[PDB]
Amino acid sequence: MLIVPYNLPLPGGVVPRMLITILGTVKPNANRIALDFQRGNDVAFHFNPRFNENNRRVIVCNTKLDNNWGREERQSVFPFESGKPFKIQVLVEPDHFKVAVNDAHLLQYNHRVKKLNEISKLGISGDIDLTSASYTMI
Ligand SMILES: CO[C@@H]1O[C@H](CO)[C@H](O)[C@H](OC(=O)c2ccc(C)cc2)[C@@H]1OC(=O)c1ccccc1[N+](=O)[O-]
Ligand SMILES: [Cl-]
DSSP: OBOSSEEEEOTTOOOTTEEEEEEEEEOTTOOBEEEEEEETTEEEEEEEEEEEETTEEEEEEEEEETTEEOOOEEEOOOOOOTTOEEEEEEEEOSSEEEEEETTEEEEEEEOSSOOGGGOOEEEEEESEEEEEEEEEEO
């Protein structure tokens, strides 16, 4: 078990066939989770489950450039449950991040930040107990 917020270094950034696995349990009164794939201060890929946005559950994805949030991509398919263990897998492909939760495909997010080899940190934060965060080459 790790202390959140947690920074996972991604040395030399990400590359196609890099599979990032995040294992954790959602806290019982969860409001939000965030994965932030960072290129310095920019967020190439913000993955943000929201448990209570207007009494709905939604996943918000976005990019932050020069400290400005861009256009949101939203997904109502919401595989997280308060109190339950999850696995998030982010598979880097040539043109998008592919996200599967609990071995079920969830969403794709097209690369807005092009410099994948400079996306050198993943921030993990929010209402989770973090069990592990790691990556491998498939
Ligand atoms: C102004 O809205 C932004 O949309 C951005 C993407 O487009 C980011 O999701 C932003 O999240 C943050 O940057 C953020 C929020 C809180 C903390 C502690 C750290 C970062 C932020 O999101 C929120 O603050 C937010 C708004 C409504 C419901 C739930 C949340 N939320 O889960 O924080
Ligand atoms: Cl870029």
